[PDB]
Amino acid sequence: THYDFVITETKVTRLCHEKTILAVNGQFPGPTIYARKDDVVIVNVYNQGYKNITLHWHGVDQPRNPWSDGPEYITQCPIQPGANFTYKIIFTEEEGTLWWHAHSEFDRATVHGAIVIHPKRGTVYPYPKPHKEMPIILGEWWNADVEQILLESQRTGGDVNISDANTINGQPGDFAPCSKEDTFKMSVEHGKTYLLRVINAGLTNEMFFAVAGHRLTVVGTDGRYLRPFTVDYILISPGQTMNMLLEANCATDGSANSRYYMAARPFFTNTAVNVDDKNTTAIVEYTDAPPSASAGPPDSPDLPAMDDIAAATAYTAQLRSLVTKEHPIDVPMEVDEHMLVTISVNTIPCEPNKTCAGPGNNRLAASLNNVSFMNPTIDILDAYYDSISGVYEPDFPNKPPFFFNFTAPNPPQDLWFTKRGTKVKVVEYGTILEVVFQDTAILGAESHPMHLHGFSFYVVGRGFGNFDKDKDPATYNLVDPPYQNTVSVPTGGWAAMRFRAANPGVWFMHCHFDRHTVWGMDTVFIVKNGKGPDAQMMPRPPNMPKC
Ligand SMILES: *[C@@H]1O[C@H](CO)[C@@H](O[C@@H]2O[C@H](CO)[C@@H](O)[C@H](O)[C@H]2NC(C)=O)[C@H](O)[C@H]1NC(C)=O
Ligand SMILES: *[C@@H]1O[C@H](CO)[C@@H](O[C@@H]2O[C@H](CO)[C@@H](O)[C@H](O)[C@H]2NC(C)=O)[C@H](O)[C@H]1NC(C)=O
Ligand SMILES: COc1cc(/C=C/CO)cc(OC)c1O
Ligand SMILES: *[C@@H]1O[C@H](CO)[C@@H](O)[C@H](O)[C@H]1NC(C)=O
Ligand SMILES: *[C@@H]1O[C@H](CO)[C@@H](O)[C@H](O)[C@H]1NC(C)=O
Ligand SMILES: *[C@@H]1O[C@H](CO)[C@@H](O)[C@H](O)[C@H]1NC(C)=O
Ligand SMILES: *[C@@H]1O[C@H](CO)[C@@H](O)[C@H](O)[C@H]1NC(C)=O
Ligand SMILES: *[C@@H]1O[C@H](CO)[C@@H](O)[C@H](O)[C@H]1NC(C)=O
Ligand SMILES: [Cu+2]
Ligand SMILES: [Cu+2]
Ligand SMILES: [Cu+2]
Ligand SMILES: [Cu+2]
């Protein structure tokens, strides 16, 4: 239950391009954290790299413990080069696959890895024990330094350059230059069942994923078991994890191919904007098969087309929490407070005496309820703890300031603009929230993977168009809604979720597309202390990084 994570400058080559990246213990992707349910894991982080950095344990509630949550300028100031910081990871309700990643600038492009939470001693999976288990991390690679990719977009105000490759476990696969020799491969035996722990650690796109010749029985997401269902492909958004069983029963007598492509490719609908639409591949190989069976290329799966919204919708519609005596559910039935949160990509005016590259030669930005989040220089949590004025404003609104036909295509150019601010939403301990995410069509309808630190939540409804507060709740799933930490909000639509705010602390909420995070598609919940020691935020650790 103890790890040393040294942030290292590491030389890595992909697509024949060598660069120095930040990595953890010289590994890209980084090491897997292994835990069992309810473990407490300690990670000593030594920053031996060239820049400020933080780490985040994605999907771990961290009850009463925002100090170890990681988001830069939200719960901590950064770990400076040459400094260290000890994170305490408190696992509670989570069982399944999570992941960890840098939470500073675009550093998670290379600084990320898996978290595996096994059933605790004396318990077992709700499904037959898989023969083997394999993390499958989907990601992106840029040939350029990712710091330079970010800085350039900061300077121009235009869109972030697309990645040069999509990757599986850091490897682009068979169809990228200088990549076929090191394509990720996994061995399977006929008749055995394998648990694929799929993590979308990319920065930019939701992804379709499939394995040629093999159906996938999805059994969990975001650390919570799902009602099992079997499919030919999945959709997975950045931030999400999805666990699924693969049954390796293809013929090993030579009558069938012995190699099958695992493949992923974006789900992306904005036909106006560029995208890294390159597929990424890995190989599932039946090892106990004759050498003649691997003669030709591996079989390829049918992936949905990149703009196939129906295929995305059809996968997401199947997600339901597993509800059993061993795995019960607690859907909040009586809501204390409703929020409607509009999600938009925006512009702000270009700074004086400069030309910008965003829409209308303005600067790109993003907003929640038309507030474009701006990081403070004293982190929110310290400001909250020490009652430091002039850092944040506790009046993030429950509703957008101006109602309009949110999802009507091509809104007028005046609706592009937003306004920066550092606003948070303060709630009393135990408040039951229904948060309805509403995509707008400003600068293009787009599916946003909204993520809440400190909590998972029940996704009780979703639909296309404008959420109707007087009709859509009538068909909410209040019985077994999926319990997620990151929700794919529909393209040009809405998603409703509920949770009890019973974790005292300072909790970031943001789109898990990093470009939208930096552009300001974020806010913060401050959950006040309740009554009782168990409802008290932990005290500040002695060696928090200085601001
Ligand atoms: C989001 O906020 C921006 C900035 O406050 C709003 O844009 C302003 O709109 C008013 C008229 O309502 C103009 O007088 C200002 O000049 C605008 N500011 C600009 C263009 O920077 C925008 O209307 C809001 N959008 C919403 C609420 O959807
Ligand atoms: C790395 O992080 C540190 C801590 O946030 C930054 O140092 C602070 O910079 C602000 C300017 O915004 C000063 O007001 C503080 O006095 C600094 N605190 C220190 C030095 O402890 C530093 O700027 C960051 N580096 C980069 C490149 O962003
Ligand atoms: C739909 O919102 C976007 C608009 C734009 C428009 C950019 C024009 O400069 C870019 C984006 O990044 C991929 C967006 O996510
Ligand atoms: C880590 O940082 C602390 C300062 O907070 C320092 O005292 C210590 O020597 C550093 N190195 C370790 C713990 O190995
Ligand atoms: C981003 O892409 C453009 C090509 O569209 C290229 O000119 C530019 O150099 C790229 N930026 C970086 C930092 O590589
Ligand atoms: C991936 O893309 C390459 C290049 O377009 C294509 O030849 C190959 O068939 C694709 N693979 C799959 C599994 O779709
Ligand atoms: C900077 O912008 C102002 C306002 O548009 C303009 O009057 C001034 O000439 C500019 N400075 C230059 C071009 O050096
Ligand atoms: C809102 O916009 C949609 C899409 O154009 C349109 O079908 C609908 O009629 C509009 N609703 C109202 C009330 O104008
Ligand atoms: Cu995350
Ligand atoms: Cu998170
Ligand atoms: Cu986050
Ligand atoms: Cu987004």
Side-chain angles (χ1 to χ4, degrees):
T1 47
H2 153 247
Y3 292 83
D4 291 330
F5 271 19
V6 183
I7 310 308
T8 58
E9 307 183 42
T10 299
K11 298 208 308 207
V12 168
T13 304
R14 300 289 187 277
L15 315 177
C16 272
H17 285 72
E18 185 182 72
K19 58 162 172 179
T20 70
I21 65 173
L22 296 181
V24 170
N25 297 340
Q27 295 163 58
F28 162 64
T32 296
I33 290 168
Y34 287 98
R36 302 187 83 151
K37 190 179 186 297
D38 288 302
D39 277 354
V40 176
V41 173
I42 304 305
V43 180
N44 307 122
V45 177
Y46 297 90
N47 186 4
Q48 300 291 111
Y50 47 76
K51 68 180 303 298
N52 284 349
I53 200 169
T54 68
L55 295 194
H56 169 62
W57 322 99
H58 177 114
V60 185
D61 288 340
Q62 291 284 46
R64 317 187 302 108
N65 188 33
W67 305 103
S68 279
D69 190 46
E72 206 190 29
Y73 298 106
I74 308 303
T75 60
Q76 70 171 97
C77 278
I79 308 170
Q80 291 185 56
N84 66 83
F85 180 64
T86 295
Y87 288 92
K88 175 171 46 172
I89 311 172
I90 303 169
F91 296 98
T92 52
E93 62 180 346
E94 307 90 356
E95 181 175 311
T97 306
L98 292 175
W99 61 300
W100 57 265
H101 59 78
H103 211 301
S104 43
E105 295 188 290
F106 282 2
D107 296 338
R108 74 176 181 89
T110 57
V111 176
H112 61 263
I115 300 175
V116 173
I117 310 101
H118 282 126
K120 76 155 76 191
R121 304 171 269 211
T123 66
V124 293
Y125 296 122
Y127 43 84
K129 185 210 180 59
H131 184 241
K132 305 277 191 185
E133 316 187 353
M134 189 57 68
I136 301 295
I137 300 176
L138 310 177
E140 296 182 278
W141 169 269
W142 286 258
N143 288 323
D145 291 6
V146 176
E147 301 93 348
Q148 291 308 302
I149 296 289
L150 171 62
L151 176 64
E152 171 198 41
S153 75
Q154 288 174 333
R155 289 168 158 170
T156 69
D159 207 348
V160 177
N161 276 21
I162 63 167
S163 55
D164 298 288
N166 288 293
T167 60
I168 295 176
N169 289 337
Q171 288 294 346
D174 270 10
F175 299 100
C178 315
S179 302
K180 196 171 174 174
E181 72 295 306
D182 290 317
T183 296
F184 177 69
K185 312 180 130 84
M186 72 177 296
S187 305
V188 296
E189 305 172 50
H190 170 87
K192 299 311 209 196
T193 296
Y194 295 85
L195 181 64
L196 307 185
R197 302 177 174 269
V198 186
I199 297 157
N200 188 343
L203 271 63
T204 315
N205 296 300
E206 310 181 354
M207 304 286 290
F208 293 117
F209 170 92
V211 184
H214 296 71
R215 315 246 298 156
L216 307 167
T217 301
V218 175
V219 290
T221 184
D222 290 358
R224 181 54 164 84
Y225 293 116
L226 291 163
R227 187 183 202 280
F229 64 102
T230 302
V231 297
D232 301 310
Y233 69 89
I234 69 162
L235 173 85
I236 187 173
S237 303
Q240 296 178 333
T241 73
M242 297 280 171
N243 284 356
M244 62 218 62
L245 300 165
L246 170 144
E247 197 174 80
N249 45 36
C250 282
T252 180
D253 67 353
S255 49
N257 205 330
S258 61
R259 299 187 306 157
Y260 299 83
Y261 273 136
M262 189 187 288
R265 197 184 52 199
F267 165 53
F268 187 79
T269 65
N270 222 334
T271 166
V273 153
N274 205 14
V275 58
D276 179 2
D277 59 5
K278 287 158 186 169
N279 65 51
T280 180
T281 50
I283 299 169
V284 176
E285 184 161 358
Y286 284 75
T287 41
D288 293 337
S292 84
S294 60
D299 279 20
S300 296
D302 286 327
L303 286 180
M306 183 164 61
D307 66 346
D308 192 349
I309 304 193
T313 306
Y315 177 81
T316 300
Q318 300 186 66
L319 299 174
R320 295 157 70 193
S321 288
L322 176 70
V323 185
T324 70
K325 181 190 137 188
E326 297 174 18
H327 304 289
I329 198 182
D330 183 12
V331 184
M333 300 300 294
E334 300 164 68
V335 168
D336 297 310
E337 184 167 9
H338 301 253
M339 298 180 77
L340 181 68
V341 180
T342 51
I343 301 164
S344 296
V345 181
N346 298 108
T347 57
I348 58 175
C350 198
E351 46 271 33
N353 295 107
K354 192 234 163 60
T355 303
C356 291
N361 300 110
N362 299 298
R363 173 171 284 283
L364 276 166
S367 62
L368 298 179
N369 278 339
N370 205 25
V371 186
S372 185
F373 190 82
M374 172 171 55
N375 280 349
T377 56
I378 295 175
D379 61 282
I380 305 285
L381 175 50
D382 281 321
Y384 170 57
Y385 194 72
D386 289 336
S387 299
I388 301 174
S389 71
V391 175
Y392 60 83
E393 287 164 329
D395 62 354
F396 182 86
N398 281 15
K399 314 294 182 177
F402 172 70
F403 277 72
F404 65 101
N405 189 343
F406 300 121
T407 53
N410 310 123
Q413 195 152 332
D414 42 297
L415 284 180
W416 291 2
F417 291 93
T418 190
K419 177 179 193 177
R420 282 176 174 171
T422 308
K423 299 189 172 295
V424 310
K425 167 79 178 161
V426 179
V427 298
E428 300 295 341
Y429 185 93
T431 301
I432 294 167
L433 293 150
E434 177 170 307
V435 178
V436 180
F437 295 115
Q438 173 74 73
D439 187 39
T440 79
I442 297 173
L443 290 170
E446 180 168 26
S447 170
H448 301 274
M450 292 304 295
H451 172 52
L452 174 60
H453 292 215
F455 305 93
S456 282
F457 45 78
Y458 298 98
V459 177
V460 294
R462 53 173 53 248
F464 291 109
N466 304 323
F467 173 74
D468 183 347
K469 68 179 177 184
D470 300 311
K471 304 182 209 176
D472 286 315
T475 54
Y476 282 174
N477 179 357
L478 308 178
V479 170
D480 53 11
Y483 192 52
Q484 292 169 276
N485 70 53
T486 300
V487 53
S488 310
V489 182
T491 309
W494 58 271
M497 61 76 160
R498 288 181 187 175
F499 72 107
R500 318 179 181 273
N503 181 357
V506 170
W507 305 112
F508 208 29
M509 184 171 71
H510 61 94
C511 177
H512 215 298
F513 293 155
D514 274 29
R515 69 196 187 278
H516 296 168
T517 306
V518 297
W519 291 347
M521 202 177 284
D522 311 316
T523 187
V524 181
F525 287 93
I526 299 188
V527 176
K528 292 170 61 173
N529 290 338
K531 226 173 271 203
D534 201 19
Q536 310 303 309
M537 189 176 71
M538 290 177 184
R540 171 202 284 125
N543 292 124
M544 292 307 292
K546 295 311 152 233
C547 293

